[PDB]
Amino acid sequence: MVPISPIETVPVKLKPGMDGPKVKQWPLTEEKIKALVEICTEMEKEGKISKIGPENPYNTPVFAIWRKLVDFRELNKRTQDFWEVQLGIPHPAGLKKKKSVTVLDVGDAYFSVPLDEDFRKYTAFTIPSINNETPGIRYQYNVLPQGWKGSPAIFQSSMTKILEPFAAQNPDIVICQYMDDLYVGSDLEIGQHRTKIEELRQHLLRWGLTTPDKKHQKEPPFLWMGYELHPDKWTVQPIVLPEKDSWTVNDIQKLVGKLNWASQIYPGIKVRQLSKLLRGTKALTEVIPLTEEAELELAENREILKEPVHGVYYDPSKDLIAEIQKQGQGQWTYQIYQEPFKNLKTGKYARMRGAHTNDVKQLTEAVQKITTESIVIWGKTPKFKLPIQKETWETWWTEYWQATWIPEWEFVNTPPLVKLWYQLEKEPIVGAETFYVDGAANRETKLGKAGYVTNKGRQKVVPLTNTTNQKTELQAIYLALQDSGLEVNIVTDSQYALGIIQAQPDKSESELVNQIIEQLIKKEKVYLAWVPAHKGIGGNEQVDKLV
Amino acid sequence: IETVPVKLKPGMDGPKVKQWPLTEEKIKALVEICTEMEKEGKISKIGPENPYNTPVFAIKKKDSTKWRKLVDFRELNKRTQDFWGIPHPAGLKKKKSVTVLDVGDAYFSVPLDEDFRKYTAFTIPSINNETPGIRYQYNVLPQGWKGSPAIFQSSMTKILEPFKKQNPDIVIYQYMDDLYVGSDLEIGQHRTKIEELRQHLLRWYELHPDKWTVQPIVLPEKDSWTVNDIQKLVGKLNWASQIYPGIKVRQLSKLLRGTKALTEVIPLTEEAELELAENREILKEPVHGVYYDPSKDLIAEIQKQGQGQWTYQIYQEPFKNLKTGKYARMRGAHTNDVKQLTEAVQKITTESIVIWGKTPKFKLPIQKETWETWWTEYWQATWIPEWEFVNTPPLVKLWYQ
Numbered sequence: 001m002v003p004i005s006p007i008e009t010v011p012v013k014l015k016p017g018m019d020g021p022k023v024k025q026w027p028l029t030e031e032k033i034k035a036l037v038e039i040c041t042e043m044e045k046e047g048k049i050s051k052i053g054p055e056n057p058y059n060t061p062v063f064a065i066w067r068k069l070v071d072f073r074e075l076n077k078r079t080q081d082f083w084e085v086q087l088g089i090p091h092p093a094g095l096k097k098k099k100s101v102t103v104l105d106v107g108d109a110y111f112s113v114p115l116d117e118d119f120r121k122y123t124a125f126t127i128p129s130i131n132n133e134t135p136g137i138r139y140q141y142n143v144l145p146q147g148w149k150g151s152p153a154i155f156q157s158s159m160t161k162i163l164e165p166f167a168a169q170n171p172d173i174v175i176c177q178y179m180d181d182l183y184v185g186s187d188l189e190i191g192q193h194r195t196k197i198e199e200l201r202q203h204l205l206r207w208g209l210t211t212p213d214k215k216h217q218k219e220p221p222f223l224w225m226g227y228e229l230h231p232d233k234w235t236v237q238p239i240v241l242p243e244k245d246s247w248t249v250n251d252i253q254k255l256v257g258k259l260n261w262a263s264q265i266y267p268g269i270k271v272r273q274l275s276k277l278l279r280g281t282k283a284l285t286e287v288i289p290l291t292e293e294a295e296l297e298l299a300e301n302r303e304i305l306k307e308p309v310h311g312v313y314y315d316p317s318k319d320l321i322a323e324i325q326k327q328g329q330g331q332w333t334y335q336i337y338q339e340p341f342k343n344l345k346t347g348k349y350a351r352m353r354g355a356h357t358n359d360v361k362q363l364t365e366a367v368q369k370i371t372t373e374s375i376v377i378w379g380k381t382p383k384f385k386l387p388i389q390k391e392t393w394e395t396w397w398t399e400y401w402q403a404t405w406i407p408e409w410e411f412v413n414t415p416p417l418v419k420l421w422y423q424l425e426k427e428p429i430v431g432a433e434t435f436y437v438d439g440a441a442n443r444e445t446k447l448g449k450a451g452y453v454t455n456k457g458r459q460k461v462v463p464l465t466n467t468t469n470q471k472t473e474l475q476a477i478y479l480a481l482q483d484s485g486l487e488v489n490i491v492t493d494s495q496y497a498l499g500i501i502q503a504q505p506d507k508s509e510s511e512l513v514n515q516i517i518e519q520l521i522k523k524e525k526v527y528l529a530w531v532p533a534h535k536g537i538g539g540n541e542q543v544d545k546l547v
Numbered sequence: 548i549e550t551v552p553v554k555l556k557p558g559m560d561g562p563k564v565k566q567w568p569l570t571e572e573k574i575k576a577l578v579e580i581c582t583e584m585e586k587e588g589k590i591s592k593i594g595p596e597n598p599y600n601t602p603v604f605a606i607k608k609k610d611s612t613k614w615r616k617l618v619d620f621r622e623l624n625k626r627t628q629d630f631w632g633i634p635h636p637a638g639l640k641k642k643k644s645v646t647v648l649d650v651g652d653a654y655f656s657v658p659l660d661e662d663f664r665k666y667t668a669f670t671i672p673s674i675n676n677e678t679p680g681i682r683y684q685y686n687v688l689p690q691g692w693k694g695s696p697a698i699f700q701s702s703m704t705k706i707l708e709p710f711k712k713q714n715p716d717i718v719i720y721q722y723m724d725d726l727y728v729g730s731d732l733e734i735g736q737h738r739t740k741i742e743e744l745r746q747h748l749l750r751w752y753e754l755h756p757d758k759w760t761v762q763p764i765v766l767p768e769k770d771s772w773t774v775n776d777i778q779k780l781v782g783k784l785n786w787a788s789q790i791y792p793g794i795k796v797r798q799l800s801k802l803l804r805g806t807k808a809l810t811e812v813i814p815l816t817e818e819a820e821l822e823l824a825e826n827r828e829i830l831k832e833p834v835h836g837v838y839y840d841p842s843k844d845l846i847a848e849i850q851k852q853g854q855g856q857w858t859y860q861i862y863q864e865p866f867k868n869l870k871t872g873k874y875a876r877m878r879g880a881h882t883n884d885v886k887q888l889t890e891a892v893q894k895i896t897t898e899s900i901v902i903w904g905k906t907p908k909f910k911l912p913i914q915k916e917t918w919e920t921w922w923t924e925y926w927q928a929t930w931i932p933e934w935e936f937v938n939t940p941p942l943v944k945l946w947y948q
């Protein structure tokens with residue numbers, strides 16, 4: 001025999017203040033028992049497990065479904081935390097195209113990596129004897145058990161430590177690890193490629209690791225994590241959209257998930273109208289009807305999912321480009337590509353839940369998302385094509401009270417364009433009428449008044465029912481806008497209204513605010529001044545709206 | 548050469564903080580640096596049995612093209628036991644000039660406690676999550692950790708003993724990986740003294756505090772006032788009444804009696820000018836009963852004024868400002884708000900360190916996502932303060948301008 005190379009164990013401890021698992025063994029049928037006996041006999045012959053004495057106080061339940069199933073849930077509850085290597089998943093668009101890509105899955109995967117001997121005694125388990133007339137058969141693991149918390153991480157680190165020297169000695173190829181599979185890729189000739197694959201599986205064989213000796217059991221396209229990986233392109237596995245005249249909340253969640261998953265390569269996927277029905281969740285059993293918006297939207301989704309769309313792989317020698325389009329109702333869509341008409345991937349961004357908003361902010365947030373996603377996937381920020389004029393952005397960020405930034409970008413003329421709908425003056429307007437506005441309401445009777453007086457003697461007070469202080473304060477400003485010329489000065493004591501307007505929204509959830517905005521849009525020059533209330537400031541008549 | 552035992556605060560497990568994404572160049576720089584540091588025994592590769600992690604990224608200091616490794620030891624710092632205490636040099640801020648030195652290279656000579664090393668674990672991330680990243684842990688004293696200067700205190704004392712005995716007029720303070728040196732000499736003599744001190748630290752950023760003070764509230768001085776002018780004035784004075792007790796505005800408000808156009812000039816009555824003058828006299832005095840509390844946090848607020856101008860206020864209780872200022876320095880950030888804000892935060896933090904010996908908690912006028920996306924691109928300091936985000940526009944913006 002040739003002594004295969006050993007593998008250093010990974011030191012594992014239990015959580016501090018806890019001890020090894022001690023669980024009562026479940027009652028098993030005689031058939032199950034026999035099956036388990038044979039299986040564990042074969043395994044013991046292989047060297048995966050070992051028989052132990054009664055000294056070991058730890059025990060783990062085991063079932064049969066023949067295949068044995070050791071329930072390590074309690075031991076997992078009592079086993080330390082590990083640096084889990086799976087957080088987030090690779091994206092096919094991030095992979096750099098190679099002329100050849102081979103797959104080597106690893107058989108005897110976990111049962112080829114030794115377990116820390118000091119920890120083996122905690123993985124002890126027993127097999128119920130026939131009729132329980134004899135003491136159960138005691139076993140412990142000598143390798144990594146499947147289902148154990150520490151197995152994937154330790155297996156991964158061992159595999160890395162083994163693969164490192166082959167990689168270092170073969171920079172002309174690229175090796176990737178994922179669970180029980182290895183993906184090797186190169187731009188070499190097919191003969192030299194297969195050659196280096198052989199060298200690799202020989203190298204692994206030196207550590208006693210077995211790979212498919214025959215022609216490799218899997219050839220392109222590779223079905224991986226819901227993706228189809230083809231030699232020249234990638235896509236997603238076929239979409240599955242159920243159709244029923246009675247929908248539940250869970251069905252809505254699954255549909256939303258599937259549509260979101262499909263939206264990464266299929267452009268023009270919308271999910272708002274269906275997501276609005278997820279309010280009041282945690283009740284998985286329900287019957288939620290569909291609006292015309294939602295039905296037309298789902299029909300359009302079946303229109304987009306009609307014909308297959310493929311994404312390409314990444315080429316580092318070419319620039320990285322992301323283009324953005326406004327879809328309305330707070331919806332945004334984007335495409336990330338390097339060559340025209342050939343997408344690396346696509347996506348969508350929905351606005352956050354707020355009271356007020358404008359297009360520029362949302363666009364900025366979209367750019368943020370795309371940027372972060374890009375840095376994750378390709379390790380760089382893409383050049384942007386945005387539906388917004390340079391001058392628009394300039395004016396916006398220059399006058400905006402917050403700090404804001406967009407990486408390198410260019411204007412693409414594809415409507416609808418993001419524009420500034422109105423701009424407040426910085427100084428009072430000469431020759432413009434001056435509207436001193438005010439509003440007030442009774443907290444008890446919910447009755448109120450809103451109005452204005454101007455320097456030219458123009459006056460108005462309007463009575464209001466079912467309203468509040470803030471609503472009347474807004475209403476007064478709205479009244480000032482309605483009955484004024486193309487240029488107007490406006491004085492208010494409302495910090496609320498001033499805040500809202502200085503937030504510069506172009507759309508709101510409050511109809512009154514929307515109306516005010518529509519008024520602003522019609523205006524040529526508007527100066528909005530603020531003063532403290534109840535300071536005896538003449539013009540500011542709190543005594544006019546408190547009657 | 549002898550490791551001092553270090554533990555954590557009772558009831559606190561080690562740090563498990565997510566490592567955020569990095570660009571390829573920063574990842575490469577970090578790979579290079581950590582490869583070199585591994586060959587120098589400063590760090591060591593670890594296995595999956597180490598679940599602890601601390602964020603890490605790469606920067607570039609001033610006048611340097613060589614990358615640098617920066618570790619966000621914030622979570623580990625607040626989870627690390629409290630070390631003990633040296634009273635902050637209150638004369639450091641009173642000195643004419645202070646120079647900042649980087650003594651981080653010294654820390655790497657002192658080995659770290661073995662049992663504690665697993666808490667310093669960090670990860671060089673991989674692009675597209677192809678690998679679980681390159682994992683390291685520190686063997687020596689890590690730069691950025693609050694325990695490093697605390698442990699190195701005796702050593703630094705021993706090294707700086709002769710220089711301290713030599714120049715009793717020179718003040719020496721230490722914060723993290725930085726050494727602040729204050730004096731009243733001349734810039735040339737200053738620089739030669741600095742080369743001297745760095746040579747003394749070898750064999751073993753000009754900053755002028757005197758050109759920075761606290762800022763008074765000023766009122767306009769006009770010959771003719773418009774309605775708008777008086778409205779803004781009354782607003783400002785009303786705001787300032789929250790700070791200064793004797794501020795009254797009734798006689799100024801009396802001028803606004805009636806509904807006049809905003810651009811209309813109004814002559815001031817004698818009572819109004821008197822009231823204004825009194826208000827001025829009041830504002831010229833300092834604020835009543837304003838003390839510093841070491842047990843309380845320092846809060847810093849920053850407002851964007853436009854045209855590369857920024858204002859800031861450090862305080863503990865509202866309207867009780869401990870420090871105020873206005874950063875307007877332009878240096879290659881003419882087209883970038885975020886860069887300006889980052890530099891401003893750094894400067895304010897520096898001043899805060901010089902004055903109180905600790906960093907303030909910031910309230911940044913920027914969306915969380917934006918800041919979190921871009922702030923590491925312009926950061927050149929070895930420490931990192933805490934921050935939150937204000938989403939509502941403050942009205943007081945033009946009251947500091």
Ligand SMILES: N#Cc1ccc2ccc(Oc3ccccc3OCCn3ccc(=O)[nH]c3=O)cc2c1
Pocket residue numbers: 090095096097098099100101174175176177178183184185186220224229230231232313676677678
């Ligand atoms: N972590 C991780 C991970 C997960 C799944 C993978 C699948 C294929 C693959 O393959 C690659 C392996 C090494 C280097 C370059 C690769 O892919 C470039 C793109 N590509 C693909 C399939 C094909 O048929 N042809 C190609 O050009 C690498 C992988 C890595």
